[PDB]
Design a protein around this ligand. Structure first.
Ligand SMILES: CCCCCCCCCCCCCCCCCC(=O)OC[C@H](COP(=O)(O)OCCN)OC(=O)CCCCCCCCCCCCCCCCC
Ligand SMILES: CCCCCCCCCCCCCCCCCC(=O)OC[C@H](COP(=O)(O)OCCN)OC(=O)CCCCCCCCCCCCCCCCC
Ligand SMILES: CCCCCCCCCCCCCCCCCC(=O)OC[C@H](COP(=O)(O)OCCN)OC(=O)CCCCCCCCCCCCCCCCC
Ligand SMILES: CCCCCCCCCCCCCCCCCCCC
Ligand SMILES: CCCCCCCCCCCCCCCCCCCC
Ligand SMILES: CCCCCCCCCCCCCCCCCCCC
Lengths: 478, 299, 102, 100, 162, 314
């Protein structure tokens, strides 16, 4: 299928971010300017975000034998672009203290955002694979951006080796799936089977291998051991991007794949995913009980929240609001992780050399940074499922989705994990107010971003109807 | 107060000082034992190299490597070593290891007569020949109180200029070959063969004529020297222009040669640099004009 | 077809005879006759640039054999491909990544 | 006349051999080599699957696979060179600074 | 046709097995290049001519060249590697080999239960691959160029000397 | 055993064997002819006493190099040291293996063609790499890093230089390439492709002016293998250039082999003229010319060729 002008105007964020990458590269080649390159990056990302409105005017259609644009793509493209914009905003004050070159950071962030947009628009195995690697390789660059520091280099090595292994697993799984089916389209993965032989062994094994790869990419047990080390070693804006944008894009393409593939209805895959979600919730909540580091604790938090997301994922073929629940939860989790990691980055900015520690020391943050401490405790209560927060609305959606499909083991897992998360989140939020013994508008912009995220979480926890209406308006193609 | 006063002509494991009067000039008996042990130090010289022996400091930071070019170079300028302190491809410190061509010419001058030393004066700069013979016989004639006639002066000037052209042609050819163009050296060695034909006709030899004498020259000019000189003078300029257009106006040779190892008048003055380099620094100092000799004022 | 199996036999004979001829001359050379620094990262950068531009070259290899069938749309797509490749090359040149002597 | 199952078995054998080399080898270089073997085996499986169905999809996915493999090999070798420059060894078990 | 496939598959299996159990990095890379040549022979026996051409042009002609470049740059003389023999002790390799063998039998059991009419081996030319590449796969080509650019930028940023 | 199929198979096998023998003797006699032509360029004679006109000098060299003492260094890897001349010979030999010398006279009518030439050159870089590593000498190691960096920096655009002829022919086959030159030879439209392929083929053959030592540790038959592989590679590049840019065997009056051999021998003579005339550029300008100039030239040439082809296709 060829590309029409309607297909071109439906391709607007991809083309805009790619043109931004080219323009930023030509600006770096002209003259190394940190402010100009960061401004070009954020202007390109904002241009993609506002060209999403023209894409919505263009309607929902299939643009490629690979891509499909609908409200699903709109919502996940918007989430990825917001995460990338926040990552650049947090990254500038951190990069102000960087002695080495700073302009490659925004190039990598733009390319990773392009991969996220491709994953949002993906309707093919090739597009899913290419979006996964287009997210992964800039994350290889960003995690080990401060390669002089031992922690960042170690996290980069671990992430690169494990993601190469998971990409090999995922590609072998796609190869087995393609050998079984014969077409790489999402809708055709199982159309050649009928009258009750959907559980073909080669198709199931291939889908299990891509389940292994994506469970690495979504920090799911037992492919979760990289998460605290990579989250801790990487720079804090990189931790922000890796927590929000990569997870959101990969879970969106997993949503689309499991919705469109007829083999997603098979019971063995659903039982395996139920076991994975149960173990992910329990392990990611239990392993953060005694963490004195905020980054590892937030990594185990990411593991538990992706377990809740997978719990909402299992009832996709039974319930009707499961993808709506996933959208609401992902918006709330985006805002929660954005606020938390933004406070972490603003405390960790500027970069004070590679030989000096990047220790958080969150105890008594209110007595010198009251607004950031208020934002941090608001996001800590939001991540716990405590009411008048958007995370509570997402948790309520997950609970209703689990109640509809009689997945009571997963619901009990959610309750127990919520109790353990309550313990450690409240420990952090109350350690903020104990007793322990900037000067530019980019830092003010980052503080404004985290304050706006906290106010958005509070307002959409008190009044969640506009977000629910927006997510319901993002209706994909049946 | 010398920074490093080591032996420069003899090896470091040499006993005695050769230019002293009590040192025997003639060769000692050869021993394969000395050669074999010296092969052992040649073997462990790369392993047991200490930069403090050569005056270098802070050797092996550990960002510097030591490079030895010699002892045998693939060129006609002789055999010698240079040890380089390197950061990647950048030279930071280097001292040349010389003395591999020491022949004891001064000590030989103390054991040859005033007449029998002239062939040894030939082999000081072996591309020079009569150019090397001239200052020795001039100084001996100063000792003897000899004022040579005019024909002797013009004959010596002729042979010195012929050998100067020979040496300059070989130098330009070797520089072009070192740049990378291996073609013009054949034609310029044919030109050197023309010069050698004239020199063979006059002095009876090619490279070391031994023809200048105290008070004159060994023979009169052979009958027919002007014919060979006229053919050589007609032959030279077209070949010179051909070599110029072939290599010395080439842009690759210019890029390889321009701006490489440049120094000014102060550096040439403080280091005793003479000849082409000193005049290239803008200082007009030639002995044939400032302190004229051998009747060079009449040319 | 007889021609195709004959051509396959001819190619197999060419490969076998060439390899065996070089092996035989190595054996003959071994048989006859009696007896008696730290490398910089610029090499890695050059080889990595070769690898990346060789993969983009393989994409252009795939495109070049089907230019007529792809039409002007394929020309436009390859134009954006080559423009991105040239932007990357200009980026590499302008930052001194391809300059050996600093 | 070649069965598809035999090509898939060959690809699986190469994949588990590369994974075994990735696990049992403490060197980072041999880990990268095993990763290269695994991604090449996945590309081989895609080529066999594409050639069984008579489609160019297998070769296109192989082209994407080797683009990723080349880029990943470049990335891992850059990280290996950084590790060898700043630590003078390639021990992957010794680089374990953060844990728990 | 099938003879070349089986012989090249056995050669690739043996070469990769010698790769994973070797101590010399250059010998391991040479056996890896031999396995790549054998896998390209497997590609050519299956009719995927472009796959084998890009296997020896790029995989055995660029990536392995980069690996040999890095190995000879490091001057790996087996310091604390050649003198350890750690992977050859059974207490180290019995576990992972048993695990990989178990996964191999699971994947083989999955493979043996699929419909298989065999591979006809009709040669799929590079012309059709280039038609599909710049036809239904335009965005794949452009974003793969983007991915190669990203890998180039990251490897330049990491592998600098300063 | 009398059957036309077996007769045709044996005839094609004999044709391939004849092509290979003519190629190896042409490479050796071209080393001798390089010596003779350097003598001709440098106003001298060269070897003209061993036999009639010096034609037996090659036999003397072969006998000496066969009966020299074969040497492998004591502290060196035997397999890699033995394997480097194998690659340096056979890689560019099988690069020749696709060249069509006449209608009905070809070794392999492959569907990949100059793609297979690219595979063979990418294999051929391993000869320099292996000779540098197996010598156990850091000087030869650094020289091999430099030589391999040069060959990579020019193989990065060798194939893209050939892509203009690929685009105009519309196929990877060499017979289709020489059939598409029935009216205008490819040197006229693909002139930039012609000069870039000339530079790339000169550079990947380790010849003047793109060379340098990693040859110092080899002697006897291994050095002779490297030498004859270099000259066989020059023959290979010359014949590929003839079949890609000058119509190959196509000519008005003479038989096709006469035209092909005349064009090939002219390009060998041009190789010797290039060696005799041009000086040695430095490393930085050589790599800068390889990367900054030739590769964008090949990209722009491919774009212009595509635009011209699609404009001419009504
Ligand atoms: C079958 C295949 C083979 C076919 C055989 C026939 C064709 C042979 C082709 C040989 C090509 C050789 C290419 C040599 C390129 C050298 C580039 C280089 O490094 O040039 C450096 C030099 C100086 O550059 P710069 O940086 O300015 O240095 C000044 C610093 N003070 O830069 C300069 O001096 C500027 C000029 C650079 C070189 C331009 C290209 C010249 C190519 C050689 C002449 C060819 C003429 C035609 C031959 C017949 C063709 C049919
Ligand atoms: C003999 C015992 C072992 C001796 C030592 C090892 C020697 C090398 C063994 C492997 C390579 C040769 C294998 C045998 C090939 C013989 C030719 C053949 O089978 O051709 C069939 C087919 C021809 O093409 P097609 O059109 O499919 O023909 C169908 C017939 N109507 O062919 C094809 O379609 C493709 C043919 C294969 C691809 C080309 C050749 C690849 C060679 C890879 C070598 C890898 C390195 C080996 C190293 C060994 C030593 C360590
Ligand atoms: C020191 C020795 C190391 C090992 C060297 C190699 C060992 C094996 C030697 C014996 C090989 C026997 C012959 C194999 C088959 C040859 C014919 C063939 O491959 O035919 C298949 C195909 C035909 O193509 P075509 O005619 O267009 O098809 C249309 C309809 N069939 O044509 C093709 O697919 C052509 C493409 C494949 C050609 C492969 C050629 C050899 C490749 C390996 C070179 C190794 C170089 C030395 C080592 C490098 C460093 C490791
Ligand atoms: C329930 C959702 C969240 C509502 C807001 C929770 C509080 C946010 C932070 C507001 C500022 C807190 C200031 C506390 C000061 C304590 C001083 C103690 C002195 C002994
Ligand atoms: C640690 C979490 C434990 C959760 C237990 C939940 C038990 C649910 C039982 C459901 C039974 C359904 C039978 C039909
Ligand atoms: C440098 C030239 C290399 C040539 C290699 C191939 C040699 C093959 C010999 C074929 C001979 C017959 C050619 C066809 C017959 C028509 C021409 C007859 C007179 C030559």
């Amino acid at each position: 299928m060829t590309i029409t002008p309607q297909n071109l105007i439906a391709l607007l964020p991809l083309l805009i971010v790619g043109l931004t990458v080219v323009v930023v590269m030509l600006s770096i080649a002209w003259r190394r300017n940190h402010f100009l390159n960061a401004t070009l990056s954020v202007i390109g990302l904002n241009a993609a975000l506002v060209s999403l409105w023209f894409v919505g005017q263009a309607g929902a259609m299939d643009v490629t034998p690979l891509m499909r644009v609908d409200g699903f793509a709109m919502l996940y493209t918007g989430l990825v672009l917001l995460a990338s914009l926040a990552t650049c905003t947090f990254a500038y004050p951190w990069l102000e203290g960087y002695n080495d070159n700073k302009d490659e950071f925004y190039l990598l962030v733009l390319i990773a955002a392009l991969g996220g947009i491709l994953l949002a628009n993906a309707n093919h195995l090739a597009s899913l694979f290419l979006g996964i690697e287009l997210i992964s390789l800039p994350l290889f660059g960003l995690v080990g951006y401060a390669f002089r520091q031992k922690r960042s280099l170690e996290a980069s090595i671990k992430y690169t080796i494990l993601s190469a292994a998971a990409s090999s697993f995922l590609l072998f799984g796609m190869a087995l799936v393609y050998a079984q089916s014969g077409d790489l389209s999402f809708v055709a993965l199982g159309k050649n089977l009928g009258d009750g032989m959907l559980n073909e062994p080669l198709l199931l094994a291939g889908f299990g291998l891509m389940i292994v790869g994506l469970g690495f990419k979504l920090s799911l047990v037992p492919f979760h051991l990289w998460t605290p080390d990579v989250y801790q070693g990487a720079p804090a804006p990189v931790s922000t991007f890796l927590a929000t944008a990569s997870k959101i894009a990969i879970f969106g393409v997993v949503m689309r794949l499991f919705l469109y593939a007829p083999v997603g209805d098979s019971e063995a895959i659903r039982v395996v995913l139920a076991i994975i979600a149960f173990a992910s919730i329990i392990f990611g909540n239990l392993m953060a009980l005694s963490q004195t580091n905020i980054k590892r604790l937030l990594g185990y938090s990411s593991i538990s929240h992706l377990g809740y997301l997978l719990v909402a994922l299992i009832a996709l073929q039974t319930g009707e609001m499961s993808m709506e629940a996933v959208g609401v939860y992902l918006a709330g989790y985006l805002f929660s992780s954005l606020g938390a990691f933004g406070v972490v980055s603003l405390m960790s900015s500027p970069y004070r050399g590679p030989d000096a520690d990047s220790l958080f020391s969150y105890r008594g943050l209110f007595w010198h940074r009251p607004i950031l401490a208020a934002v941090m405790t608001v996001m800590m209560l939001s991540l716990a499922g405590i009411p008048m927060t958007l995370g509570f609305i997402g948790k309520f959606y997950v609970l209703a989705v689990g109640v509809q499909a009689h997945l009571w083991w997963l619901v009990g897992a959610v309750v127990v994990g919520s109790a353990i998360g309550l313990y450690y989140y409240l420990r952090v939020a109350v350690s903020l107010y104990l007793h322990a013994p900037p000067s530019n508008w980019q830092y003010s912009a980052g503080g404004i971003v985290v304050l706006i995220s906290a106010l958005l979480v509070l307002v959409l926890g008190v009044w969640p109807q506009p977000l629910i209406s927006i997510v319901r308006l993002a209706m994909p193609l049946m | 107060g010398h920074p490093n006063l080591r032996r420069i002509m003899m090896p470091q494991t040499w006993k005695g000082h050769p230019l002293r009067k009590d040192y025997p000039a003639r060769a000692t008996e050869f021993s394969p034992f000395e050669l074999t042990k010296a092969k052992q130090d040649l073997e462990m010289e790369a392993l047991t190299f200490k930069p403090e022996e050569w005056g270098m400091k802070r050797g092996t930071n550990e960002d510097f490597m030591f490079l030895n070019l010699g002892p045998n170079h693939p060129s006609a300028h002789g055999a010698f070593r240079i040890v380089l302190q390197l950061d990647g491809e950048e030279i930071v410190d280097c001292v040349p290891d010389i003395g591999y061509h020491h022949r004891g010419a001064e000590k030989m001058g103390e054991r040859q007569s005033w007449h029998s030393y002239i062939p040894y004066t030939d082999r000081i700069e072996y591309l020079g020949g009569c150019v090397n013979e001239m200052p020795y016989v001039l100084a001996v004639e100063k000792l003897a109180g000899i004022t040579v006639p005019d024909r002797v002066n013009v004959i010596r000037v002729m042979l010195s200029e012929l050998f100067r052209i020979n040496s300059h042609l070989l130098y330009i050819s070797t520089f072009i070959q070192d740049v990378g163009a291996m073609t013009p050296v054949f034609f310029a060695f044919t030109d050197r063969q023309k010069i050698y034909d004239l020199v063979e006709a006059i002095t009876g030899f090619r490279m070391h004529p031994a023809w200048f004498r105290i008070g004159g020259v060994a023979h009169d000019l052979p009958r027919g020297w002007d014919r060979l000189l006229r053919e050589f003078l007609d032959w030279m300029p077209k070949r010179l222009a051909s070599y110029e257009k072939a290599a010395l106006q080439n842009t690759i040779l210019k890029g390889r040669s321009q701006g490489v190892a440049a120094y000014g008048a102060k550096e040439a003055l403080e280091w005793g640099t003479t000849g082409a380099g000193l005049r290239a620094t803008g200082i007009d100092f030639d002995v044939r004009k400032a302190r004229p000799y051998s009747g060079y004022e009449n040319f | 077809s007889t021609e195709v199996i004959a051509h396959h036999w001819a190619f197999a004979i060419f490969l076998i005879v060439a390899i065996g001829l070089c092996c035989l001359m190595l054996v003959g050379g071994w048989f006859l006759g009696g007896r008696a620094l730290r490398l910089s990262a610029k090499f890695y950068l050059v080889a990595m640039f070769f690898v990346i531009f060789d993969v983009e070259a393989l994409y252009l290899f795939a495109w070049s054999t089907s230019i007529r069938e792809s039409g002007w749309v394929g020309f436009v797509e390859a134009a954006i491909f080559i423009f991105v490749l040239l932007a990357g090359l200009v980026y590499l040149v302008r930052i001194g990544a391809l300059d050996w002597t600093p | 006349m070649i069965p598809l199952q035999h090509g898939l078995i060959l690809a699986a054998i190469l994949f588990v051999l590369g994974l075994t080399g990735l696990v049992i080898r403490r060197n980072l270089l041999f880990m990268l080599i095993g990763l290269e073997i695994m991604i090449n085996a996945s590309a081989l499986a895609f080529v066999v699957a594409g050639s069984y169905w008579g489609q160019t999809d297998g070769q296109v996915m192989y082209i994407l696979a080797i683009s990723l493999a080349a880029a990943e090999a470049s990335i891992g070798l850059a990280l290996l060179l950084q590790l060898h420059r700043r630590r003078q060894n390639l021990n992957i078990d010794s680089v374990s600074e953060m844990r728990g | 046709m099938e003879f070349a496939f089986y012989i090249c598959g056995l050669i690739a299996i043996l070469a990769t097995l010698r790769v994973i159990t070797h101590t010399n990095p250059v010998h391991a890379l040479l056996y890896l290049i031999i396995s790549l040549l054998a896998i390209s022979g497997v590609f050519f026996s299956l009719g995927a001519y472009f796959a084998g051409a890009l296997e020896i042009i790029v995989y055995a002609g660029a990536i392995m060249v980069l690996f040999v470049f890095v190995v000879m740059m490091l001057n790996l003389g087996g310091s604390e590697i050649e003198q350890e023999r750690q992977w050859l002790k059974p207490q180290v390799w019995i576990g992972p080999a048993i695990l990989s063998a178990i996964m191999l039998v699971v994947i083989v059991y999955a493979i043996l239960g699929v419909n298989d009419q065999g591979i006809d081996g009709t040669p799929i030319s590079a012309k059709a691959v280039g038609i599909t590449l710049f036809g239904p796969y335009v965005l794949a080509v452009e974003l793969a160029s983007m991915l190669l650019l990203a890998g180039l930028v990251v490897a330049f940023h990491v592998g600098r000397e300063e | 055993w009398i059957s036309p199929e077996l007769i045709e198979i044996l005839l094609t096998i004999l044709k391939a064997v004849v092509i290979l023998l003519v190629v190896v003797t042409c490479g050796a006699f071209m080393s001798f002819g390089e010596r003779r032509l350097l003598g001709l360029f440098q106003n001298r004679y060269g070897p003209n006493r061993v036999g009639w006109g010096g034609s037996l000098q090659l036999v003397a060299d072969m006998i000496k190099m066969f009966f020299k003492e074969d040497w492998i260094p004591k502290f060196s890897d035997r397999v890699i040291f033995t394997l480097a001349p194998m690659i340096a010979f056979t890689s560019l030999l099988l690069a020749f293996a696709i060249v069509p010398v006449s209608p009905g006279w070809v070794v392999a009518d492959l569907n990949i063609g100059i793609l297979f030439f690219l595979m063979m050159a990418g294999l051929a870089v391993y000869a320099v790499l292996f000779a540098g590593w197996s010598s156990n000498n850091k000087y030869s190691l650094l020289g091999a890093m430099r030589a391999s960096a040069q060959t990579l920096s020019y193989e990065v655009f060798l194939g893209l230089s050939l892509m203009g002829v690929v685009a105009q022919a519309g196929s990877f086959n060499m017979t289709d390439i020489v059939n598409s030159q029935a009216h205008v030879w490819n040197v006229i439209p693909q002139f930039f492709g012609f000069i870039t392929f000339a530079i790339a083929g000169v550079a990947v053959c380790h010849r003047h002016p793109f060379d340098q030592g990693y040859h110092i540790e080899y002697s006897g038959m291994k050095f002779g293998l490297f030498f004859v592989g270099e000259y066989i590679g020059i023959v290979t590049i010359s014949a590929l250039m003839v079949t890609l840019f000058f119509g190959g065997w196509q000519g008005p009056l003479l038989p096709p082999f006469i035209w092909f051999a005349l064009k090939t021998a002219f390009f060998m003579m041009m190789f010797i003229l290039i060696r005799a005339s041009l000086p040695r550029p430095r490393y930085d300008q050589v790599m800068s010319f390889g990367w900054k100039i030739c590769l964008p030239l090949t990209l722009i040439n491919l774009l212009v060729t595509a635009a011209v082809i699609l404009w001419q296709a009504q």
